Write a protein that binds this ligand. Sequence first.
Ligand SMILES: [Zn+2]
Ligand SMILES: [Zn+2]
Lengths: 82, 50, 209, 235, 59, 101, 117, 101, 169, 287
Amino acid sequence: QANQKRITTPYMTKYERARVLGTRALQIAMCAPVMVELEGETDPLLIAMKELKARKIPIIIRRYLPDGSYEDWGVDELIISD
Amino acid sequence: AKQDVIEVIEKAHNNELEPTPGNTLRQTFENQVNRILNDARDKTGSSAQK
Amino acid sequence: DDEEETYRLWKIRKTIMQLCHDRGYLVTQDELDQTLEEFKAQFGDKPSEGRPRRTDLTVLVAHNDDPTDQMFVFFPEEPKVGIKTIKVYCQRMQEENITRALIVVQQGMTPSAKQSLVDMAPKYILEQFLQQELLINITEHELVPEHVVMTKEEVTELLARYKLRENQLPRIQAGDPVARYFGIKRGQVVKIIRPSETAGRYITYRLVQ
Amino acid sequence: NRLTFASTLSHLRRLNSPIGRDGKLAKPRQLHNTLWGMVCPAETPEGHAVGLVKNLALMAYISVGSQPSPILEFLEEWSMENLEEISPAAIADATKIFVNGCWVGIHKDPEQLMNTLRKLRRQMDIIVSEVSMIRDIREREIRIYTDAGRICRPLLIVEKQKLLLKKRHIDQLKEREYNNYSWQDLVASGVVEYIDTLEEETVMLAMTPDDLQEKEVAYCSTYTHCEIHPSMILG
Amino acid sequence: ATPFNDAVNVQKISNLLSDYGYHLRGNEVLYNGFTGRKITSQIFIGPTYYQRLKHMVDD
Amino acid sequence: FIKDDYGPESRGFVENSYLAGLTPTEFFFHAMGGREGLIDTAVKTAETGYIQRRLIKSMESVMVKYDATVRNSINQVVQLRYGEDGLAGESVEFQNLATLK
Amino acid sequence: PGFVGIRFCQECNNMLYPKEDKENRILLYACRNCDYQQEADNSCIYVNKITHEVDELTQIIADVSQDPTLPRTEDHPCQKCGHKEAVFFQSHSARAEDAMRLYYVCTAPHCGHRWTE
Amino acid sequence: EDREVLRVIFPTGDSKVVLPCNLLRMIWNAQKIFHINPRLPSDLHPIKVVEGVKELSKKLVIVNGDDPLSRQAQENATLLFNIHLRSTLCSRRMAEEFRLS
Amino acid sequence: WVSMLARGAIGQRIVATLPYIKQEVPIIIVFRALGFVSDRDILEHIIYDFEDPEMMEMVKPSLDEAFVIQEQNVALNFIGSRGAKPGVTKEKRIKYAKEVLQKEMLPHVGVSDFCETKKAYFLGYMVHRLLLAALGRRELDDRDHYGNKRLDLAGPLLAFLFRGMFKNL
Amino acid sequence: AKNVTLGVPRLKELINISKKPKTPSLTVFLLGQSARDAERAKDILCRLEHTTLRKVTANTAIYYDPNPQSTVVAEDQEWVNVYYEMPDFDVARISPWLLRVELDRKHMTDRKLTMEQIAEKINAGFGDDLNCIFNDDNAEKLVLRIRIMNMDDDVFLRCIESNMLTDMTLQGIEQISKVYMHLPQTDNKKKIIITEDGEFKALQEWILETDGVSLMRVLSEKDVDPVRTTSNDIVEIFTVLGIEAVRKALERELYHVISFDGSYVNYRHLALLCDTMTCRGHLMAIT
DNA sequence: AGCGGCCCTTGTGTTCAGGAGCCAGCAGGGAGCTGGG
DNA sequence: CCCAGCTCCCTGCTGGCTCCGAGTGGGTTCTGCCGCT
Ligand SMILES: [Zn+2]
Ligand SMILES: [Zn+2]
């Protein structure tokens, strides 16, 4: 699929957001490197959520299409709504 | 209401009641009775609410 | 006994003209909307006597895009049409070099006759219709949306746009009254445009089977 | 169930209809008009056994059973005619007489017959109190029953327009511990009668003695039975 | 409290209750236990026979 | 009651209120109107529960793919756009068209 | 017209079936088992009343007056004896939509007069 | 033209419709957020209302694609909304009814 | 069971689903198997008032349906043939029907011999009830009417067990 | 007016397409003057409601008339000779078994039926094998005398008699027992037009509600609206109109069932169900 | 002491959830074909 | 140069198979016995 013309939606779905916060929380729970600053937060959830609001999550979402193709949308390229 | 139904019963008992289009005489009698009683319930219900 | 028969014949003829006009065949506007009086003056009002006879109601139209691509419409006299009658029409179509025809029966059609309409499919694309179901144009119904027969070029663009195969689109039985009305066969795609209270207009595409 | 005295009594007075809880038909589960006085219209589970599992009423008494031999002897001694001795021509105007479902014979004057049989049951005579005697009038059948399982309940007999339970009875019932005057002596006096569901159809009850008094407009004026207390319909 | 007893209705019970210094309709003035302030709506209060069911939470 | 009495009290007219107290006949009749409610509430659970299952198993895999179209497990197309508009039923709400009437 | 009753043979007491004498052109009732024959006198062999115009007064019986569950009234006296009291009930017979009609009976003994208003 | 499109879509006089966004409430919210005075003249050029609505209708993309097949679906998907939008955000209504700035 | 065939040969035929027989049997065949061959005697047991032609016209189809049989022996042979145990010889066929109509059919009326008259009189009343129901002269019976039900208590209950077990003993 | 199935039973029959619903009915709309007046509407109602000879017959009777000249009945001797004075049929091919049927003026006038129409239907369903005559529409009793032209005759007469009273359709369409005509008080059934001024106007026109379902025949009738006439039997809709019609008809029935109790469900859900049940060309029942 | 069978009383026997929708099997009847006179 | 069997196919009826809400907490009873080798 041509990444220059991606027909999928530019907004991150509630499900894409859920799995992103979840998967990123596990990494932080496994003592993974943090991308943004932290004041006093010790929970991987609060850390992952702030990373999304900051748009500094190093994850790529592979949106599969019915025909079989796929589109790799990075967490930084998607527009967060909620 | 109980007096009206007694009149409706007297009418049907004296063959003075005709069936309505699309309903049997018995169905007509029950419909009239159900209407009289349903109206009394609504009238009594309004009087109480007031 | 008689005034009703001529009324049925006229309504059937009007529906046929609307049908042939929807398929893309050249039909004049005058005959498209023909009053009962005009029909009686052109054919008669005494089918019981033989004026008009169902053999005179035979219609012959030509496609707008291709003049030689004609279409027949026969009105057999026997209520139950047999295989012998189909051979007569198939023979007549061979003489005039026509490949399409419509058989509007009165009561029904024998099983052996229906099979004859299937074996001669590649040579003669002839269909069967009951006059009882032709007295009304189903497309004029409120429940029946606007159907449109798509072309191979339009279909290819459709499959290429949504990136799907033919077996993925919804299906419609070839024996559907609308499919028979528009004269569509297996493989063809029909575009339906129906009103939607959520979006106003909804365009779907159904594959014939 | 030994969780409370009420459950024990209810369980010992419980009924069951073998229609199957799986059944989804509401006709057998509905509260039929014939559950009056014999069953509690309120006491019933609210789960998947509504209307099937019932509970007897307070004054409900299920018959124990009795042999029809003595009744058949009294009928034969009576003017009743056997089934094999009669001719079919006499069945037109004559009234049939059944016993536990067995067609025994026919009769000509059934009015005085029931009046006699009723008098015998009210005196604790050959016919016991548990015997049911239904005289269908439109249909000339007269069905007598002595089988068991016939749910019945007591009721106060009623004369032309008055009760048979006079004040002299209530006096004796107050001194029940001294003069050993109990319910049995009350039934034998012809004041009370055990009525079954099948006989209630031919019985005209009075909810209370107040209905027996003279009113501006006579409703029935021909009562033949009366209820001891309407609250007895409850379990 | 026999179900069908015309000699006992809601009116007779109310009149008998007004003789003992209580509201004939059972209502009674209550005081908020946290602040002692009266309750604007005269509450209904009286003895009622309640039952405890074997369906406990510990089980 | 007498035979052939289609009157209100004989056919189940509860002319009394729950405060004034119901009569024996009116009480028995009231139990029928109630018992009919219990029976229905106890019977519809199976039929309605069976329906909730039937509807799901037929529409358990139908989902909105990434191309905004509605497809089932077989990849077949049921709707080119959800609800013919591609909109969710949460944010929508009733309105009034001014150019209609 | 009225219905037609079954005719039984005099030899085997079996039902007689209808038959026509082609020679004499007359209706005959013969037995399908024996060789008995009878000259019909009604000329009608079948009658079906679809409207069911049945007079229930013949189905009612005077013994019904002994029913205490039936209502009594003094406004409709008996025409055969003059008795005032009389029981009234509905038809309650199927195939009759106009079943609300009242049928009266005299409570006097040995009279059993029936009528309708 | 849209007026007739609704007549053929809604043959009955039922204007009650379900749509994503309530324009009457958002306009009301704007009146209170910017302190709009319904008695003073408005400074809203009607051409900005028309140009703004046309540009907005293009930003609502239920279907992504410039081909004639996709543009027809997008025009048919947002049809009912674009109609209710042009009828509520009309230049006249915004001048004598809402009087937004 | 004593049923009436739904309308749609000529009229409505009356049959009888006797026990130990898997095929419906016209009521007249049963009446003849009990020793009543004359249709007059049969109707005398069913119809008690010959002045009611409405009932006589309703039973005529059953009569015309079974008229080839006019003796007790042939009727018994027919009944035995309709059952699931058709004896190759007509002798035991009649015996199988004889003991069935004498033991299984209406045992409450009598299981001994010479009681064929009582069974017919009851079977006649059984048909009389069916005609009255079809002619509207009587109301159908309600399955929920407890006057038509019985309560099996410990008495009639424990007796069934003791009886079955005493036999095993 | 009529009993209609609603609630779970109606919701059930839809999800599991049933070929024998409990309360199938039509929604007949009239086109012209019949839509405004009641006299013409009744004529259409009678043209749809199935009417057999049993509905208009009062009592039948089979007689043995050896010579029609001197009939057994005395009140039918006036018009029988007025018809027999001239040979209209093969008198030699006559049977002495007569079938005298008596009708009722009430049921006959309520349907605008005459012995003439009845005679043609009899002479058509049985040809000339069954000769039929009748008196004028002036006598106090409607009577038509039938004979068999040439099982026995008397037995054959009772056979066709009990049969003709059931399968001989005098007027109407079979499978439609009864029809109810009424003026709709709700605007969902009225005729919503657009006046010349542009305003919506709800005309109160007569509509008929049937107990059966026969679209192919009802739709093909004069004075019947071929555009709005629909039904609740989704099966007949698919066999007559197609898959897209039953799709909308199915959605309308579900909406009516869910909205009857004042509730409301988003249309996008009803569409998904109706589409899943029609995305394969056939009515994919949920079973 | 261990291996085999089988108690449902009628060896022949009552309903072991009974009733509402698809589907396979077969009797029935009409179309059409075809080798005889 | 018709025609009655013969074949093929479609209607209609009968009979057989599957389905019959989600959960939860207690209780009792039983998981062989007798004839034969
Ligand atoms: Zn004889
Ligand atoms: Zn008198």
